[PDB]
Symmetry: C4
Subunit: 238 residues, 4 copies
């Protein structure tokens, strides 16, 4: 335990955290420069080793963090993420992974408390949304099957495959070129195609708008519940 | 009644409901595989009979459910839907109906209580919206007549018909290519066409945004009404 | 006054109002049929006189309504609208006005109380919005001048004129093809054009979103003010 | 101080402020006329000197305002803006600045209290949003690096440069032609490009919607906090 505590004061120190963040920022700046072919020609050698050095340091950090937090490390989503991102960066270049290495810049989120809280807040609406997500996904899936069967033969790029219909349906949901780009061309062969896509647009839009309304109103309901109980206690206690 | 109760314990049992859901899911998976021409070549025979078997089972289920619920079955929207969807699936292939058969996967909504509640919640805003829907539809109808008269002769695809103008107006509402795709071309012949479509976009957008604002605020009003009465009773009772 | 009251019981009767609405609906149906060249060939003669008859009746109605309400008629926006729309319909065909005649179908709004209330509610947010509308319009006006000067020479269709720049800026606000259709082409000649349109998109979007947030929140503030005073009175009276 | 007060009664007078606003409006009208080549041919000489006269007056005003407010002038954002805009207008034409001169029409905002308040209100949400803006910007930056590396070689116009990828990513966020214009073309070479842009669209949309929800709900929380304390005091005092 003497050893354990020695490294624990380091890993827990303000300086340790600041250093890592410093590195994350430097490496973030570096990753953008590596975008310039000009810059690389001149200083690519400098940068590649700095990336190996940062990742070496980040690996020492994850290791030390694990000896400190023990099992609590892998029950922590933020630490898992730092693990998974640093580990990606450790797979040798010998291709998609080379690009995923830049995800280690999200470590600037996992290391900065203000950013953690933002992401925690945003994520917290999701668990209550899961069933609505399930229902929407079932909706897409049913309509994707139908679209593939109705239109996949004459419009294979957009509907010849369940995957392609899923993609197209998502495009229609975003309303991106849904009429000039998809439904009008479809209607030149299938004049009733509008009977398929208009209702689909109504549902997907109605559901999303009403999901937002429910989140706002149902939160106010809770807010009103919390303060209603506090007031009644003062009425009751006084 | 002995007979009646025997089948009522079945139809009402946890196992009965789970089985049906199992089938709905299996059949849902099956319907997606039937999308692959490759898969069909190999196993289409297997799948077609499984669809006949599932639908046979689903028909036995609807029948049994009707002997159990009697008149209460047809006063239930969820049961009507299961009826109407299973009945569609019973029309012989000898074409649009073949595709509508996939609607029986929405039965995964009518059989799962969590999903029912979602749809019930979303639907519940609609009755209060009917008049606004009526007003919007009257608005579309008037403008569709006008557009057909103003532009249908020189732009028949987009406005030559009341139906076509309805479709185009819906496209403009979604803002999909309204300017580059419709109004700018229109303005090459009718330079004041913007006087028609800009105001139309303002109204349709203003109305929809303000419908959402009213739903949120008017709900809070009710929320505040409910808790205002509860507090006053504690002030009054205490 | 004997005479005056005789016609006042008519104009105020349930039957009188229902009749007019009946006519508005019939005439509305008629206006849609007149869209079909086929229908007109066969029954155009029938319909044109029915339109003259309805408008004759509507003119008798406005007249009678004025003898009844006297000065109160022209201080009523709904009645003014019925006046202005029926008067349009009275200008002889000997062209844009022929199309504006269909506005008399909005009379179905001015005659149906449910519809009046909808429009009243929606309109009621506007007076508080006037200054924000003014600020947005000033914003457009300034940017339209700038765009005309920056881009009107090389892109006259989109920016050669203050009016054209106003139109284009509105298109960009709706986000319709703003990048592929306008800014990317602009950037082939003016590579910094993004410095103009991106900020413009940020402001217009930020302002509109925040106008909606303010309306919702400021209404809740009032709702909370009203119920806060009611509760305090019960605390104070009890 | 005698001198100081003499000019202070002027600069602070209702008449002084009204005059400036009068000029701002006249000059605003003038700036729009200067857009017409026809108008300029006839009256350009008139207008150019009127612009020199207005700016001369506006310079006298800023000067006088500074002798009056002393150090308080440069600690005032509204006054800084009037300074910075009038100063721009003072750089001799001997080009982008000639266009920036029209920014002096925003002085109609800095001089009209109603407009000041609007802008103050809208701006006031921003300080609390800074971290979310930072997180979104980090998000863009990471994805821009990735896009440049994944697609910049085969699609240089859209992704060959970190700047170009930033621009394209912003376009995708606005959903402008994201599928037909960018991702579908990308997918003809990179069939998994959807794995990159769909999630990107989900995050950016989820974050913005949820930022709006949080602003509305967190404001209500405060509203409820303020009135909860007022009620409890009446319960407690009474
Ligand atoms: C809770 C809601 C359910 C969520 C549904 C999730 C959506 C699943 C999408 C799977 C996409 C499959 C790959 C793809 O898109 O390409 C199509 C392939 C290629 O066809 P090919 O064989 O090349 O001709 O052809 C195929 O592979 C089509 C076969 C796909 C069957 C997948 C079944 C998923 C089970 C969904 C549960 C349904 C419950 C009712
Ligand atoms: C309003 C509440 C939330 C609403 C969101 C739910 C709606 C579902 C949206 C689905 C997203 C669109 C899926 C998509 O783009 O492609 C589906 C894939 C692609 O198959 P594939 O054919 O391989 O690729 C497209 C064709 N190709 C190769 C030429 C490009 O093939 C597939 O079938 C894959 C199946 C993916 C669907 C499951 C995704 C749901 C997760 C989203 C929940 C996130 C919560 C925040
Ligand atoms: C909840 C679900 C709501 C969404 C329901 C989906 C209905 C979509 C219907 C539109 C389908 C469509 O436009 O095209 C498919 C069929 C067949 O095209 P069709 O024009 O008949 O044949 C063309 C022949 N060809 C290839 C040689 C040129 O086109 C037709 O045959 C037109 C038939 C229209 C039937 C629409 C009936 C609405 C079903 C809703 C049932 C209640 C749920
Ligand atoms: C409460 C708001 C009212 C809601 C309005 C509902 C909208 C009705 C749309 C009906 C669409 C008719 C079929 C269509 O779109 O194609 C146009 C056809 C073909 O012309 P064609 O004869 O082939 O030359 O030519 C026609 O069929 C045009 C004749 C259509 C007349 C339909 C009248 C609906 C009554 C609306 C009540 C008006 C109240 C003021
Ligand atoms: C903001 C509150 C809600 C706002 C929604 C209300 C606005 C109304 C939107 C109307 C939807 C657009 C209708 C449409 O796309 O086509 C109208 C049909 C088609 O006629 P048709 O000429 O046969 O087909 C188009 C031409 N063609 C054959 C070459 C394709 O011909 C017709 O005239 C049919 C008439 C359909 C209008 C009635 C639909 C209103 C129900 C929507 C309410 C849903 C509540 C959630
Ligand atoms: C409170 C915010 C102010 C609201 C501003 C309202 C916007 C006014 C738009 C007027 C549009 C004029 C007609 C048009 O668009 O075509 C451009 C014409 C044709 O140029 P042309 O002579 O054919 O060469 O060329 C022109 O006519 C350009 C001259 C237009 C001058 C209009 C001045 C409006 C006063 C705005 C107050 C400014 C306060 C700072
Ligand atoms: C977020 C809060 C609300 C935001 C809305 C305020 C933003 C202002 C939007 C302006 C609307 C776009 C105006 C427009 O499209 O054209 C402007 C006109 C047209 O001039 P013109 O050159 O004759 O026509 C275009 C060129 N041409 C002939 C080839 C087509 O030439 C003009 O300059 C006319 C000036 C019209 C601007 C005044 C309109 C403001 C009223 C909107 C307030 C409605 C409250 C609900
Ligand atoms: C609040 C207001 C916020 C909005 C401010 C508006 C700034 C817009 C600046 C973008 C202007 C632009 O891209 O084009 C105009 C100039 C001239 O083009 P330029 O590329 O220099 O000349 C092309 C020559 N030619 C025709 C023979 C090919 O292009 C340039 O010269 C580029 C110079 C960029 C200056 C941007 C400085 C930001 C001003 C913000 C001041 C604070 C307020
Ligand atoms: C808090 C979130 C961070 C906010 C990030 C702000 C975004 C910075 C964008 C800077 C854009 C640079 C100019 C540009 O876009 O053109 C690309 C140039 C031309 O390449 P070229 O040399 O002509 O080949 O090639 C380059 O110049 C690429 C090199 C740009 C490196 C900029 C590094 C910014 C530091 C961000 C902090 C990262 C923290 C993890
Ligand atoms: C939902 C919460 C708010 C979300 C907003 C935050 C998302 C960030 C949006 C970024 C805006 C898009 C930037 C952009 O359009 O270009 C980036 C510039 C341009 O580089 P450049 O290559 O020179 O020009 C484009 C290529 N060219 C020359 C052929 C046109 O090259 C750069 O890299 C410049 C870096 C600009 C990014 C920093 C801007 C963040 C400030 C926005 C916060 C405003 C608060 C209201
Ligand atoms: C009822 C709806 C729609 C699904 C449905 O079941 N109908 C879904 C959408 C997302 C859920 C919200 C978020 O989770 C955040 C938060 C969690 C708290 O726990 C309770 C309050 C709140 C505001 C939830 C209420 C909201 O309304 C839920 C139940
Ligand atoms: C007043 C407006 C616009 C129409 C109008 O009449 N103006 C319409 C739009 C939809 C309606 C809402 C939904 O129905 C859900 C719910 C039903 C409850 O019963 C009362 C509360 C609430 C939130 C309704 C209030 C909302 O405001 C209604 C009256
Ligand atoms: C403060 C903002 C933005 C302008 C500004 O001055 N900042 C503007 C936008 C439109 C206005 C709302 C609507 O008028 C409807 C209603 C009228 C009541 O009278 C007071 C409450 C309410 C909800 C108003 C509050 C809202 O906030 C106003 C003052
Ligand atoms: C919590 C979120 C998201 C960031 C995060 O930290 N999670 C951010 C987004 C913008 C912020 C709002 C605005 O600033 C206006 C206003 C300022 C007051 O001071 C407190 C209330 C209010 C409504 C703020 C609450 C809101 O929720 C903040 C904290």
């Amino acid at each position: 335990s003497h050893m354990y505590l020695r490294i624990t004061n380091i890993v827990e120190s303000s300086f340790f955290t600041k250093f890592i963040i410093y590195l994350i920022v430097l490496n973030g700046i570096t990753m953008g420069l590596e975008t310039s072919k000009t810059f690389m020609q001149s200083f690519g050698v400098y940068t590649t080793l700095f990336n190996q050095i940062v990742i070496t340091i980040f690996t020492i950090e994850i290791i030390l963090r694990i000896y400190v937090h023990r099992i609590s490390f892998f029950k922590d989503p933020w630490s898992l993420f730092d693990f998974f991102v640093v580990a990606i960066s450790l797979v040798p270049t010998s291709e998609i992974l080379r690009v995923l290495r830049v995800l280690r810049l999200f470590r600037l989120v996992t290391a900065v408390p203000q950013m953690r809280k933002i992401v925690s807040a945003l994520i917290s609406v999701i668990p209550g949304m899961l069933s609505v997500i399930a229902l929407m996904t079932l909706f897409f899936y049913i309509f994707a099957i139908m679209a593939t069967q109705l239109f996949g033969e004459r419009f294979p790029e957009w509907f010849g495959t369940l995957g392609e219909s899923f993609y197209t349906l998502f495009q229609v949901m975003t309303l991106e070129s849904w009429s000039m780009g998809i439904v009008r061309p479809l209607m030149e062969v299938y004049p009733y195609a509008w009977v398929f896509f208009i209702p689909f647009i109504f549902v997907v839009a109605f559901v999303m708008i009403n999901l937002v309304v429910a989140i706002i109103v149902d939160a106010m309901a809770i807010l009103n519940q919390k303060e209603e109980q506090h007031i009644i206690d003062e009425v009751q206690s006084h």
